């Protein structure tokens, strides 16, 4: 119960880091939407392992 | 460029707390997860955990929570034995996920763990 | 939690020869599995990652496939080079069931 509430609280709190480390800027725009999609589907799986 | 070097393996006794440090030098990255990976001799290679990097976010496999401890540093990384037995015994190494996909890219060459009484 | 089964745990085959070493997920992973290989007194090396792409340096007769919870390595024309230990490594730091390698296999050239 509390190690798994633990983890998913620490799962979501890494997800948000990853995505305030992508902050919004051509060229550049095209890398952070290529960054955004990625650390959209790592934070899609990492909570689908939560979600059974 | 990419380099990681380990540091720390002594001969050491049971219960005596240890050190490990991964000097983490030439990544451009800021973030990325740092992993520990021990193999006893004539074993497999084992998961014991990682941080990552910009944050201070610590993860463990199921035997490792309690008996290690992983730190963040600004040039390096370190994972400390808290009570080591001679189940401990293992070449330890470092290996850095430079993509974020989960999979280890960079190692260190290794840094030798011996626990004897 | 996670656990991959890694088979078979010896294979001896000659030069020239295909070789295919299996894991089994035990929880659904995905792209998340990794290929290494390991030759005595060295850290081991990356060959497949995200399960089917071949790494950098990696010659051409290393492949990785997946299907569900069954991952494969397969060595194409086996070289003397090949004799090694390999592992397959599963998951993600971060998920509920961690990351976890498989318990190796050892190959042998015949």
């Known amino acids: 119960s509390g190690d798994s509430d633990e983890d998913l609280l620490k799962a979501v709190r890494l997800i948000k880091f990853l995505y305030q480390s992508n902050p919004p800027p051509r060229n550049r725009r095209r890398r952070w939407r290529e960054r955004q999609r990625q650390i959209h589907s790592i934070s899609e799986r990492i909570l689908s392992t939560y979600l059974g | 460029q990419e380099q990681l070097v380990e540091s720390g393996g002594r001969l050491v006794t049971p219960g005596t707390a240890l050190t490990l440090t991964c000097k983490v030098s030439?990544?451009?990255?800021?973030?990325?997860?740092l992993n520990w990976v021990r193999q006893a001799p004539g074993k497999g290679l084992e998961w014991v955990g990682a941080?990552?990097?910009?944050?201070?976010s610590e993860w463990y496999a199921s035997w490792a929570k309690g008996r290690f401890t992983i730190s963040d540093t600004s040039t390096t990384v370190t994972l400390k034995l808290t009570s080591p037995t001679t189940e401990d015994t293992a070449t330890y190494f470092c290996?850095?996920?430079?993509?974020?996909?989960?999979?280890?890219?960079?190692w260190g060459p290794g840094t030798l763990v011996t626990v004897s009484s | 939690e996670l656990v991959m089964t890694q088979t078979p745990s010896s294979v001896s085959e000659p030069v020239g020869g295909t070789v295919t070493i299996k894991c089994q997920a035990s929880?659904?992973?995905?792209?998340?599995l990794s290929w290494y290989q390991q030759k005595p007194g060295q850290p081991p090396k990356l060959l497949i990652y995200?399960?089917?792409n071949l790494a950098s340096g990696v010659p051409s007769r290393f492949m990785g496939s997946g299907s569900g919870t069954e991952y494969t390595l397969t060595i194409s024309g086996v070289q003397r080079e090949d004799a090694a230990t390999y592992y397959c490594?599963?998951?993600?730091?971060?998920?509920?069931?961690?990351?976890?390698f498989g318990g190796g296999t050892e190959l042998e050239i015949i």
């Open positions: 290996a850095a996920d430079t993509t974020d996909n989960g999979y280890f890219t960079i």
């Open positions: 030439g990544f451009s990255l800021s973030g990325f997860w």
């Open positions: 941080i990552y990097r910009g944050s201070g």
């Open positions: 929880q659904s992973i995905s792209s998340w």
């Open positions: 995200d399960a089917s």
């Open positions: 490594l599963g998951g993600y730091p971060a998920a509920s069931y961690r990351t976890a």
